[PDB]
Every structure is written in C-alpha cells, then in structure tokens.
Amino acid sequence: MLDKIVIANRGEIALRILRACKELGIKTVAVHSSADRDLKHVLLADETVCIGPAPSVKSYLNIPAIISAAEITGAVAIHPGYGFLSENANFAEQVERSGFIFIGPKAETIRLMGDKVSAIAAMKKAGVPCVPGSDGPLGDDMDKNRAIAKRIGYPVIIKASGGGGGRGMRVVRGDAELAQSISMTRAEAKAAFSNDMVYMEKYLENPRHVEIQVLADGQGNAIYLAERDCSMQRRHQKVVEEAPAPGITPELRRYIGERCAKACVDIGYRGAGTFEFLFENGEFYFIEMNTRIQVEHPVTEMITGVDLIKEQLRIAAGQPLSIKQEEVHVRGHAVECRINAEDPNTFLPSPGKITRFHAPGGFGVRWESHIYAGYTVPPYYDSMIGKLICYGENRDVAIARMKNALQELIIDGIKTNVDLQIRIMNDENFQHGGTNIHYLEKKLGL
Numbered sequence: 001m002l003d004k005i006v007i008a009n010r011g012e013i014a015l016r017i018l019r020a021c022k023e024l025g026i027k028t029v030a031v032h033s034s035a036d037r038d039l040k041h042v043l044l045a046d047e048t049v050c051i052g053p054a055p056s057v058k059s060y061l062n063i064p065a066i067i068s069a070a071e072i073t074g075a076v077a078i079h080p081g082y083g084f085l086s087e088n089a090n091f092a093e094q095v096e097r098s099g100f101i102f103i104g105p106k107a108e109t110i111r112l113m114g115d116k117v118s119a120i121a122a123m124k125k126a127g128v129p130c131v132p133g134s135d136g137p138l139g140d141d142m143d144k145n146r147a148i149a150k151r152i153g154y155p156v157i158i159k160a161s162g163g164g165g166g167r168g169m170r171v172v173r174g175d176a177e178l179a180q181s182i183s184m185t186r187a188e189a190k191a192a193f194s195n196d197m198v199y200m201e202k203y204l205e206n207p208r209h210v211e212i213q214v215l216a217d218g219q220g221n222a223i224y225l226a227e228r229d230c231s232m233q234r235r236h237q238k239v240v241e242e243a244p245a246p247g248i249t250p251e252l253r254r255y256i257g258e259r260c261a262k263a264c265v266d267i268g269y270r271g272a273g274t275f276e277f278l279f280e281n282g283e284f285y286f287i288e289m290n291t292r293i294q295v296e297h298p299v300t301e302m303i304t305g306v307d308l309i310k311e312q313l314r315i316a317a318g319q320p321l322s323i324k325q326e327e328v329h330v331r332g333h334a335v336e337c338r339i340n341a342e343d344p345n346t347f348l349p350s351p352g353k354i355t356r357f358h359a360p361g362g363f364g365v366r367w368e369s370h371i372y373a374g375y376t377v378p379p380y381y382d383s384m385i386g387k388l389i390c391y392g393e394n395r396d397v398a399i400a401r402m403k404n405a406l407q408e409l410i411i412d413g414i415k416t417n418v419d420l421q422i423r424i425m426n427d428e429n430f431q432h433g434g435t436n437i438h439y440l441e442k443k444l445g446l
C-alpha cells in the first residue's frame with residue numbers, strides 16, 4: 001500500500017479521498033489554499049501544507065507548489081480528485097517525471113481522452129459505438145464541409161476537439177448556417193483552449209446522458225460497474241445523477257459495458273474512468289471519456305458495493321482489482337442530489353458563513369460534505385458544497401428517501417438549491433424516469 005499521499009484537491013472530494021486513505025492506512029497530506037485552512041479534511045489530515053493564496057491559479061492549479069508539497073512531506077503519490085488538474089496531462093507527466101505516482105491513467109491516456117477527435121477514433125476502432133460524424137477534424141474547404149454535412153444528414157453539431165462537457169459547440173440545421181457555425185466554434189475553441197480543431201457529429205435532438213463506470217488495474221483486468229443517468233442539467237452542469245439508468249435492461253448494460261471494458265484493454269487504460277454516451281431511441285453513442293474519478297461516483301458505489309476511491313489507490317499501489325466482472329451485480333437504486341451554495345433566482349454562487357447546519361441520517365442515506373456549522377463557504381471555488389445520496393431496493397424507495405433526507409437537511413446563513421432539489425424529486429416526469437438532457441432548463445423556463 002502507498003505509504004503517504006498528497007490530496008491535491010479541496011472540499012467534499014478531498015474529504016472523500018481522506019476517508020478512503022484512512023481506511024487503507026495511508027498517511028494523508030492535505031495541501032490547501034490560505035482560504036481553506038479550516039476545511040474538514042485539512043483538520044483531519046495527518047500533515048498539512050499551505051500551497052498558496054486563495055485564487056486557484058496560485059494554489060490548486062499551482063503545479064510547482066503541489067509537487068514541492070509532495071517532496072517536502074516524503075509523499076509517494078498525488079490524488080488530483082476531480083476538476084483542477086485531474087485531466088491535465090502535463091501535470092500527470094510532471095508528477096511522474098518528478099518521481100511520484102499520479103493516481104490516474106498514464107499521461108498519454110489522459111492526453112488521448114482530452115483530444116475528442118482522437119478519442120472517438122480510438123473508441124470506434126475498439127468497437128465502441130460512436131455518433132455518426134466526420135471521423136476527423138474539419139478543414140477550411142466549405143465544399144468538403146457541406147459534403148460531410150450531407151453525408152451525415154442535417155441536423156449536425158460542430159464540436160471543439162479540445163473541448164467537452166457541453167462546452168464549445170453549435171447546432172447546424174442547414175447549409176446557410178454551416179460556415180459561420182464552424183467559424184464561431186473554431187474561434188471560441190482557440191480563445192479557450194489555444195486549439196482551434198473542430199469536428200462534426202449527427203445532432204441528436206433529445207438524448208439522455210448515460211455514462212459507464214470502468215476500473216482497470218495494471219494486471220490487465222478491466223471491468224464495468226454499470227451506468228449512471230446524468231441528464232438532469234443546468235447550463236451543462238449536472239444537478240441530479242442516478243444509478244442504474246431507468247429503462248436500461250441487463251442486456252443493454254452487458255452489451256455496452258463489455259465494449260467499454262474491451263476498449264480499456266485495447267488502449268491500455270489504468271484506474272477509474274467514465275465513458276459518456278448519448279442515449280436515444282434505445283441506442284448508445286460515445287461522445288467523450290473522463291479519466292478522473294467524478295463527482296457522481298457515489299451512486300455507482302451504492303448499487304455495486306465497490307468503493308471506487310479505494311480501488312484507485314489499490315490500483316496505484318500495484319494491487320489487482322478487488323472484484324471480478326462476474327462478482328459485480330447491480331442491486332437496488334441510488335439517486336444523488338448536488339447541494340450548491342447558489343441564489344435561487346440568479347443561479348450565481350452564494351458564498352458566506354453557515355450559521356446552523358444539520359445533516360440528514362437514516363437507512364440508505366449518505367451525506368458527502370465538508371461543511372459544518374460556523375464554516376464559511378469561500379467565494380473563490382465551485383458552488384457545490386455537498387452531495388446527498390440516497391439508496392433504496394428500487395428507484396421509488398431511493399426517491400422517497402431523498403425527499404425525506406432533503407427535508408431534514410438544514411443549511412442556514414447561505415442560500416442553497418435544497419428547495420429546487422425537492423421540486424425535482426416531486427416532478428412527475430422525473431418520478432416516471434428517463435427525462436432527457438434538456439428537461440430541467442425547459443421545466444424552469446416554463
């Protein structure tokens with residue numbers, strides 16, 4: 001087992017990683033900004049290193065400072081969590097070059113998945129179903145670009161190869177808007193990623209977001225741990241996630257899961273990963289792969305019993321996966337509601353001091369958060385302050401427990417989305433299940 005690790009993150013996920021480390025007897029190093037001295041995981045960590053001032057550029061994105069922290073404490077590995085540097089291939093490369101273990105895949109694999117065009121090409125080669133598309137970058141020849149759109153058939157969507165997560169894209173419904181749509185996507189990608197490469201896909205009107213969780217070790221084992229539906233979104237940010245995805249049969253699960261696991265073997269994947277699919281009319285279409293552990297990982301843990309963070313750490317130490325595919329079984333159902341410190345009318349972050357706090361409890365209730373009474377949510381970071389995860393023997397029980405748990409949850413002193421989450425739980429289309437990626441913004445606009 002890894003002797004000591006740097007937790008290169010903050011808030012709920014840093015606490016999540018800390019708990020996993022403690023369970024495995026791994027010593028913890030909490031690197032934190034000057035604004036995060038009183039984070040719960042920092043207070044619980046074996047060692048702490050302040051790596052810079054509040055702004056993320058000088059702290060949680062500060063590569064030299066994070067690596068120096070690992071050096072000075074005699075740590076052997078770095079867990080990047082999600083966000084920040086978790087998908088930064090240059091960071092992973094530096095970590096390994098500096099002699100530390102990066103908890104994640106090889107840097108080359110991170111780089112591959114950050115290149116949406118080359119990632120699609122690899123998955124298609126591996127036998128994973130992808131969206132009908134350009135199968136390559138679009139050039140400057142508008143005759144060729146029109147020809148690609150015709151072959152695919154309108155409507156189409158232009159996407160940035162350096163983008164992802166709903167960022168950097170526009171829908172084209174005919175020839176008249178094609179040139180400008182390509183030009184604008186190119187410009188925005190250049191400004192945001194210094195990478196103007198763009199590609200084209202068939203536009204799917206009302207798909208669901210269904211993603212497959214994988215784990216792969218260094219012994220050549222690769223498994224899939226069912227799927228999650230993450231369709232409930234505002235401005236491409238997930239609000240509610242659940243596992244398994246409603247309407248997905250064991251046959252479909254097996255079909256798509258086996259292809260994801262096979263792809264992992266082909267590409268030499270290692271660690272946790274997520275294959276994102278658009279799912280429409282009974283068909284899966286690969287769009288992107290995330291290499292990090294994700295925000296929504298706990299719903300998968302609830303239905304499989306697999307502790308995914310502990311698996312990441314076991315994998316990094318050189319241990320094989322603790323479970324085989326034939327030992328992975330979907331049981332029950334889990335729902336996650338993201339708790340955000342946000343204004344209900346503007347949806348802008350609403351930081352400040354929590355005055356009263358009470359977490360829900362009970363059978364099937366899981367609370368993932370660093371927050372406590374008297375804790376100040378800083379303005380410098382993401383609005384998500386907690387995750388409420390409820391499990392039941394079926395979806396209806398999971399939702400019932402979520403409703404009860406949300407009513408027990410007290411967070412005073414700051415504005416939160418608890419009331420919105422309650423509304424969603426009570427929404428008759430959500431209760432039916434299988435709402436598409438556009439549902440929430442439509443519901444709120446009505």
Ligand SMILES: Nc1ncc(C(=O)c2cccc(Br)c2)o1
Nearest residue numbers: 131157166201202203204287437
């Ligand atoms: N082929 C394809 N269709 C839609 C998509 C998307 O990724 C997407 C996601 C969110 C919103 C919108 Br509009 C499109 O990709």
Ligand SMILES: [Cl-]
Nearest residue numbers: 082293294295
């Ligand atoms: Cl994430």
